[PDB]
Structure formats: C-alpha cells, structure tokens
C-alpha cells in the first residue's frame, strides 16, 4: 500500500449524520443507509409538488366549506369573484374566512348578487341596463 484514503471515517459519518433518525439497522450500518438516504432525498424533492397540490386542494375544501355555511358553492363563488374583478388567491380567500367570517359573508353576498346579475343577463344579454357590480374597469 502507498495511497490509501484516510478520511473514509468522515465521508460516511456525514451520510449517517443525516440518517440518525432512521429506524433499525439503517442508522447504524452504512450500506443500509445509502439505499435509504438517497431515496429519502429523492422523495423530498418531488414532495414539493405534493405540498403544492395538497395545500392547494386543502384551500378548496376550506373555501367550499365556508361557502356552504353561507349558502353557496365554491365553483360559483370564484366565478363571481373574477367576474367582479377581485384577484384574491385561495390562501387569503380561505384565511379570510378563518378570522373574519363577517368579511367572507360580504364576499359571499357580493358573489350571490353577481349570480342574480348574471342570470338577469342570461334572460336578456343586451337591451337592458347592465348589472351595477357586473360593470368592468377598462385599462389602457
């Protein structure tokens, strides 16, 4: 022997340092951790898109819930919001229902009024005075 790695002790310890919380013989031995440490790291990467999808769909359940408490459903709700030009994402729309249901009631009342305005427009498209809240702002 002329050339031998002396710091083999450390380059494996950093691997096991991240894998201390593993159960069984994985945290103790090396090769058991090598199979699981990269797999645990791989699951960490693509779990972000799961964190996005899970938390996104969770906000849908929350806003769908507060709407049903006030007598509406989520698909009709956001349709009236974007029709009435309010760009509030599902985070604040959900979080608003948590702390000020009085405000979310106004959002629901604002949304329900746009539905009746839209149905009035369904009866007569034009040839009538447009809805007061259905009126839009023109940017240029």
């Amino acid at each position: 022997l002329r050339n031998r790695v002396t710091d083999r002790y450390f380059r494996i310890q950093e691997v096991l340092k991240h894998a201390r919380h593993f159960r069984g013989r994985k945290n103790r031995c090396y090769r058991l951790a090598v199979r699981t440490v990269i797999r645990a790291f791989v699951k960490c990467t693509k779990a972000r898109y799961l964190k996005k999808k899970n938390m996104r769909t969770l906000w849908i359940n929350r806003i769908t819930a507060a709407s049903q408490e006030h007598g509406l459903k989520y698909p009709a709700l956001i349709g009236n919001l974007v029709k009435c030009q309010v760009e509030l994402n599902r985070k604040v729309l959900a979080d608003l229902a948590i702390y000020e249901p009085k405000t979310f009631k106004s959002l629901a009342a604002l949304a329900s009024r746009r539905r009746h305005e839209g149905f009035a427009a369904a009866l007569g498209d034009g040839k009538e005075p447009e809805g007061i809240f259905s009126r839009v702002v023109q940017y240029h």
Partner: protein
C-alpha cells in the same frame, strides 16, 4: 400507411356565412398572423416538430408573428393543428420610435402603441 396529407385548396375559401361570423372583410386583408402553440410537439412526425421549431414556436403560450403570404402559409398549414392563429389589427398606427418601449399586447390580438397603465 401514414404520410404527409395534402389538403384541398377549396377548403380554404371563405363563404359569405364565414365572413359574417368572424368579421374578416375579404377586401383590405390583414398582413400578419399572431401565432401561438397549444398542442404538444410530442407524438407528432419529424416534419411536424421541426417546422414549428423552424417557425420558432417551441414555447407554448408565446405569441409570435408571421406573414400572410402563400409561402409561409404552406408551413403553418401542415402544422395548423398545433397552433392558434389570430390576425393583427391596430387603431393607433404603426409603432413610432418614441413609443417602442411602452407597447402592450391584448387577448383580442390588439397591439396598442401607448400604455400608460391606469383606467379612464
């Protein structure tokens, strides 16, 4: 077997019914086609994917301009089923040199020369 499909030119002859629908007057025809991709490049022949790359529409939801002339028409005709086409029309004349930066596109194919960014 599957090969390049030649299209009859008679199909691309607008009738008076089509004229009243899309509002495109035949006289005074527009000059430029706003092009945008929706369908994926994958699962298409080699000639369909390189043409749209030769047109420069590898990116989706990216408006890109082409000419309204019979030569380029043959290109996006064979790959017409990969893209959207919309004509170019503007009220405010061509973009002047002073208003090169403050331009802005619209969903209706408009290209406003001036953009001061606040409502009436």
């Amino acid at each position: 077997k599957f090969t390049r499909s030649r299209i009859p030119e008679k199909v691309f002859q607008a009738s008076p019914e089509d004229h009243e629908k899309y509002g495109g007057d035949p006289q005074n025809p527009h000059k430029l086609h706003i092009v945008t991709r929706i369908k994926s490049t994958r699962r298409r022949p080699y000639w369909e994917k390189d043409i749209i790359k030769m047109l420069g529409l590898e990116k989706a939801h990216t408006p890109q301009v082409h000419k309204n002339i019979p030569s380029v028409n043959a290109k996006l005709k064979v790959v017409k089923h990969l893209i959207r086409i919309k004509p170019l029309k503007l009220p405010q004349g061509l973009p002047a040199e002073e208003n090169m930066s403050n331009t802005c596109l619209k969903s209706t194919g408009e290209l406003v020369v001036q953009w001061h960014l606040k409502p009436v």
